[PDB]
Amino acid sequence: SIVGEALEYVNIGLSHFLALPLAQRISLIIIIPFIYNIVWQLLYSLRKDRPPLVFYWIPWVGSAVVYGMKPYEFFEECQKKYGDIFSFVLLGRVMTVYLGPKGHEFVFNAKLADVSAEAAYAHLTTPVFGKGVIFDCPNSRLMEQKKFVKGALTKEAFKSYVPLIAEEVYKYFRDSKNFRLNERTTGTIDVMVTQPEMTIFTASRSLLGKEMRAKLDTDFAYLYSDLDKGFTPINFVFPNLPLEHYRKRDHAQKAISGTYMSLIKERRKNNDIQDRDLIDSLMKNSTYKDGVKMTDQEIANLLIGVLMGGQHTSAATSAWILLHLAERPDVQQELYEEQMRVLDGGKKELTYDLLQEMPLLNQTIKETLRMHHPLHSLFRKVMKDMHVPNTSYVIPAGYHVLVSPGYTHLRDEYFPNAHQFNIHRWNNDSASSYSVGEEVDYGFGAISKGVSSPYLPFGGGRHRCIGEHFAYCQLGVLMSIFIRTLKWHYPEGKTVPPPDFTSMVTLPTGPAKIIWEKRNPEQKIGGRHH
Numbered sequence: 219s220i221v222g223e224a225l226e227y228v229n230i231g232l233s234h235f236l237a238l239p240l241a242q243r244i245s246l247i248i249i250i251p252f253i254y255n256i257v258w259q260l261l262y263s264l265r266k267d268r269p270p271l272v273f274y275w276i277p278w279v280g281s282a283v284v285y286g287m288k289p290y291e292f293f294e295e296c297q298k299k300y301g302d303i304f305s306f307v308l309l310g311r312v313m314t315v316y317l318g319p320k321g322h323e324f325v326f327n328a329k330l331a332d333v334s335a336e337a338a339y340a341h342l343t344t345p346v347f348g349k350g351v352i353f354d355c356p357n358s359r360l361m362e363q364k365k366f367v368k369g370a371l372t373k374e375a376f377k378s379y380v381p382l383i384a385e386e387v388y389k390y391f392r393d394s395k396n397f398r399l400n401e402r403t404t405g406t407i408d409v410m411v412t413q414p415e416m417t418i419f420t421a422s423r424s425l426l427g428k429e430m431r432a433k434l435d436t437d438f439a440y441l442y443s444d445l446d447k448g449f450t451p452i453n454f455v456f457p458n459l460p461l462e463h464y465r466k467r468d469h470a471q472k473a474i475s476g477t478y479m480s481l482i483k484e485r486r487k488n489n490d491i492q493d494r495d496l497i498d499s500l501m502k503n504s505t506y507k508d509g510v511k512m513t514d515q516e517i518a519n520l521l522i523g524v525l526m527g528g529q530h531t532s533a534a535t536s537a538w539i540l541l542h543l544a545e546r547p548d549v550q551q552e553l554y555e556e557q558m559r560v561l562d563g564g565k566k567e568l569t570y571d572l573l574q575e576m577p578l579l580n581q582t583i584k585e586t587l588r589m590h591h592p593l594h595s596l597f598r599k600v601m602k603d604m605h606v607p608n609t610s611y612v613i614p615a616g617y618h619v620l621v622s623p624g625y626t627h628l629r630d631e632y633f634p635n636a637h638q639f640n641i642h643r644w645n646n647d648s649a650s651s652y653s654v655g656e657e658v659d660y661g662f663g664a665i666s667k668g669v670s671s672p673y674l675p676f677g678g679g680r681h682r683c684i685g686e687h688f689a690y691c692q693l694g695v696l697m698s699i700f701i702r703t704l705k706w707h708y709p710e711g712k713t714v715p716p717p718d719f720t721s722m723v724t725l726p727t728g729p730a731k732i733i734w735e736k737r738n739p740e741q742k743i744g745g746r747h748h
């Protein structure tokens with residue numbers, strides 16, 4: 219009755235294994251993790267305290283390809299098979315998705331102790347933005363940064379921003395090669411070229427000021443492009459490796475944060491600190507509640523982060539607005555009439571207050587954000603085991619949770635005929651968003667306590683957007699002027715492009731071209747240009 223002799227053959231087997239020919243060793247080096255992965259998934263499927271796990275063939279990679287390319291189609295199939303809670307493996311991480319309004323509640327209103335945004339995102343954002351801000355700091359520091367930034371985003375600030383943003387749009391119609399309205403009465407444009415440029419010109423001028431805007435007229439502009447390239451999903455898996463892409467990013471962050479710091483120390487030197495812009499505002503208001511001041515480097519870093527985030531969501535969105543309106547001359551006509559009524563045939567100057575009396579214009583923004591949530595997925599890293607209410611499911615620490623309000627935006631259940639563009643579904647409901655009941659303050663002002671609205675373009679809970687009113691102001695001024703100045707349509711045979719879901723925001727697949735025409739071919743934009 220000896221089993222020790224089997225224990226010998228274990229040792230013998232280990233030794234024969236290590237002496238296999240290389241062609242068999244390498245072969246096993248592949249085949250063993252493969253086989254184990256399959257065996258492990260099958261075993262996992264037995265657990266009742268775990269949501270269903272999407273099956274996958276390639277270890278570590280998981281469902282990355284189909285999630286990367288077609289995430290809403292991936293979610294819809296998964297939802298059909300498993301219901302609203304399911305997991306899937308993604309480049310080494312386990313993502314637990316919770317679709318629908320209950321998922322919105324589960325993730326956006328999760329306790330600070332249970333989940334972490336910075337543990338999910340910092341490896342992406344910190345190299346691009348800089349140290350000490352956003353996700354390179356505790357949540358309570360982020361809470362207060364948002365509060366500081368929000369202090370320059372007031373009604374009175376928006377009133378002074380509107381004419382600056384308008385000036386920038388008109389200058390862009392005047393000077394950009396894409397328009398030249400004093401020289402051309404019609405032309406073709408790629409909206410993925412024009413919208414990122416108009417967005418940076420308008421956001422710089424208003425949030426950063428004239429100096430920083432003037433800088434965009436120089437080679438300095440290319441640093442933003444460089445810094446921009448580092449803001450990609452590839453940094454999500456390979457945040458640092460010695461390629462040139464990574465060094466131009468690092469250099470740009472230094473050069474740009476350097477430029478903001480120079481301005482700041484200049485203003486403080488001359489005591490030229492007023493109430494013009496976000497820089498003025500963070501110079502007067504950036505001391506945390508424990509007495510610690512933000513450094514000039516941290517202020518600069520925060521400016522980069524805020525502008526870059528606001529850059530991509532807004533540029534994506536105005537691109538989509540243009541793209542949906544290009545096959546909807548009926549809606550352009552309707553918007554044009556509202557412009558004529560609110561601005562007295564154009565004899566009134568556009569102001570912030572008049573912007574608020576343009577419901578059809580804001581409804582168009584609202585509907586575009588419904589069909590095109592620029593962030594298709596939001597993540598948190600799970601920090602403690604989470605029990606899913608009314609289920610037997612437990613999400614263990616180390617998993618990630620993924621929420622996707624953009625997906626629910628496209629469901630017929632919540633939005634009848636959700637794939638049709640219809641600004642009138644928001645009739646009598648043109649607010650950018652609104653809390654349906656009770657409110658709470660996490661540090662940056664009172665916001666909706668419930669996050670169960672099927673429409674959640676700005677998220678909710680402690681990580682909620684603070685730029686929505688600035689985005690509406692910017693998009694509003696911009697579209698008010700496009701509409702009053704131009705008509706536009708598609709080249710023959712072209713229609714609304716499909717989304718490119720592989721980028722950081724879900725911009726349209728380019729080239730996305732429209733043909734524009736002056737409503738008033740003889741109208742001229744004044745001012746000087748070289």
Ligand code: HEM
Nearest residue numbers: 528531532535596675676677680681682683684685688689
């Ligand atoms: C159409 C435009 C925009 C949309 C749809 C949008 C959307 C969002 C969403 C969904 C979040 C929540 C992120 C999460 O829960 O993980 C967020 C957060 C945030 N956004 Fe926006 N955003 C827009 C424009 C802007 C602009 C223009 C700014 C700045 C001027 C801005 C600044 C911020 C900041 C500072 C946060 C907080 C991040 C956090 O607490 O984790 N956003 N935004």
Ligand SMILES: C[C@@H](c1ncncc1F)[C@](O)(Cn1cncn1)c1ccc(F)cc1F
Nearest residue numbers: 339352523524526527528531593596683722
């Ligand atoms: C972290 C980042 C993000 N990017 C992509 N998928 C998910 C994300 F959370 C983002 O939320 C995007 N964003 C939101 N509003 C504008 N931009 C963000 C927030 C604050 C910020 F200062 C800069 C910034 F990029």
